[PDB]
Structure 1
Amino acid sequence: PYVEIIEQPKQRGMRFRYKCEGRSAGSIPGERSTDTTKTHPTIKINGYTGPGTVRISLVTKDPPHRPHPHELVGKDCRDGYYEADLCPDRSIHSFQNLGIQCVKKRDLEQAISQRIQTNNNPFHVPIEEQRGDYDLNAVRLCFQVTVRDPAGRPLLLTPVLSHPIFDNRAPNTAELKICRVNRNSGSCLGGDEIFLLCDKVQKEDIEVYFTGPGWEARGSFSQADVHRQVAIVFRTPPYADPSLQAPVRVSMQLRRPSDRELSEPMEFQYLPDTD
């Protein structure tokens, strides 16, 4: 038998909580979770239905896939991992209260030691590897299901990794959001100056991205024009057609080149430049 992830966790928008915040972290939602309806990380076991248990732990994003210093917290969690029974009737199982508690950099070595001491090492990575640098802003869930064989001995199935889950404090992997913009129309000739207030971006890895049917342009600005990661002063690009007869609605959004993430689109109208 083997495990497949039916509903991946949502990658973005989750805030890892420190222990100093004595409140337990949130509940990780599934990809397709919408503000209306709430999905949850969900797996399915193909090749077996009946009594079993599941352990979920955090491992690193990048390929050694060693146990992450962060902890799962929530119901049925201890020593930074979740563990509980599967339903024997169903072959689909969901996890409604998985929270991520980030540990501090100074408490790293202690955290790693606990992973080893608690035998929380799904891919049995040697301790040699586990003195590499960790990305504390990204984790993967690791599903480790145990079923019964025909004799009723526990059978451990291959661990499956989720997609990465990113801390939304991390600007390099956060959601892009335009909060306020001082102007939403401009000359088709381009070069109109726009003040745009946004959520935290990295000035070396952000652009303003105008799009239409089979068209794209970028607003002009330097890294100096990005103010304290939360504002961009830029000039609009010229529109494809230099002699518009009438206004033309296009979309304006933030774009992060590194991972090609886009923000929610906003309406911008290029106007005919007849003075």
Structure 2
Amino acid sequence: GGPYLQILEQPKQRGFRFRYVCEGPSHGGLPGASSEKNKKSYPQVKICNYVGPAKVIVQLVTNGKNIHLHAHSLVGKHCEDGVCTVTAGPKDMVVGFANLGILHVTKKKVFETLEARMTEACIRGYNPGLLVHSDLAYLQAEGGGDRQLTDREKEIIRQAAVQQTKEMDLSVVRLMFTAFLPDSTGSFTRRLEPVVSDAIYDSKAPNASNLKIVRMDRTAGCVTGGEEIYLLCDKVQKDDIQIRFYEEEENGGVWEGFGDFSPTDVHRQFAIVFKTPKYKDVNITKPASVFVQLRRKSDLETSEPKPFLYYPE
């Protein structure tokens, strides 16, 4: 086999938030699969069986059975018009992608935004046939693979955009990397088989984390327990809800404790009055930080945790 592209590190699949235009810039880069709070990594690909100048583009695509251009935009470092374009130096063939944000289009602007993207892809020759429509492959980036779209082509895009918009999942997206190698003239037009990455799920997708603790009148208490607390939450079912206190131990252990209350203490599904559970060790000499969360007994759904401080008696 000749030259090919290879993903060295996949983007992390979960925990990242897609951002809308109105939210402002720089809200954080897309993490790599091995990224950590101490050792931060990012998506990274490598060009194999070839060493020299090269162009690598990154497009956002769909997570269905048939890959298509996504309506969302890649924004941030080296990004323009929803596409990331970096060069792969003449010696180092490994490319990384830090400070990458996923710009979530609005439901109302999905169709027109998608139409604009397919067009840009058709004008630049960035995988038209694979991402827009089968009979558009004839548009290959020839130092500008048809810098001027014909009338019949805009029609194809229009039909494609409409058909592809009736079923686009705005909460999932994938990265597709495409490498181009210099031709006889030196223009990066030689295309290599693009490779798509794992799927990336929006942390703020509809129904992501439904349960939610808005505020608690107390965030600390005695290890002894039995202390009353007023918790304000989002909608909950009095008979299918509980307050879980947990602490992740040193080894693979996890201490658990439950707030004490009855269905009648759930006030209008938007608040709960309960008593704190006794802590793991009532003889600690220094305060112990733990976590508190709402949990549905039904399907074990939980809300994001909140810190709680247990102190000695």
Find the residue that maps to 1:110 and give its secondary structure: helix
Contact in 1 for aligned 2:213/2:303 (Cα 8 Å): no
Structure 2 residue aligned with 1:17: 20
Mark the structure with the bigger radius of gyration.
2
The Cα shift of 1:54 comes to 0.9
Q: Which of the residues 84, 87, 111 maps onto 2:86?
A: 84
Structure 2 residue aligned with 1:194: 229
Alignment of 1:1-275 (within 5 A): 1-6=4-9, 8=11, 11-12=14-15, 14=17, 16-18=19-21, 26=27, 28-31=29-32, 32=35, 34=37, 39-61=41-63, 63-74=65-76, 76-117=78-119, 118-119=121-122, 123-124=130-131, 127=160, 130-147=164-181, 154-164=190-200, 166=202, 172=208, 182-185=218-221, 192-196=227-231, 208-211=243-246, 213=253, 215-219=255-259, 227=270, 233=272, 235=274, 238=277, 246=283, 251-254=290-293, 263=305, 266-268=308-310
Contact in 2 for aligned 1:14/1:28 (Cα 8 Å): no
Would you tell me which structure has more helix in proportion to its own residues?
2
Q: TM-score, normalised by structure 1?
A: 0.64
Find the residue that maps to 1:43 and give its secondary structure: strand
Would you tell me which structure has more strand in proportion to its own residues?
1
Q: TM-score, normalised by structure 2?
A: 0.58
Find the residue that maps to 1:235 and give its secondary structure: strand
Rate the CA distance shift 1:38–1:268 in 2: closer, same or farther, 3 A: same
Cα separation, 1, equivalents of 2:46 and 2:201: 20
The Cα shift of 1:33 comes to 5.9
The Cα shift of 1:182 comes to 0.3
Cα separation, 2, equivalents of 1:197 and 1:7: 39
Superposed CA RMSD in Å reads 4.8
Rate the CA distance shift 1:238–1:130 in 2: closer, same or farther, 3 A: same
Per-residue CA distance 1:43-96 (angstroms, 9 max, x = gap): 334444332211111123455443221122345434321223211211321224
Identity of aligned residues (%): 24
Between the two proteins, the alignment pairs up a number of residues equal to: 256
Cα separation, 1, equivalents of 2:300 and 2:8: 26
Cα separation, 2, equivalents of 1:203 and 1:63: 36
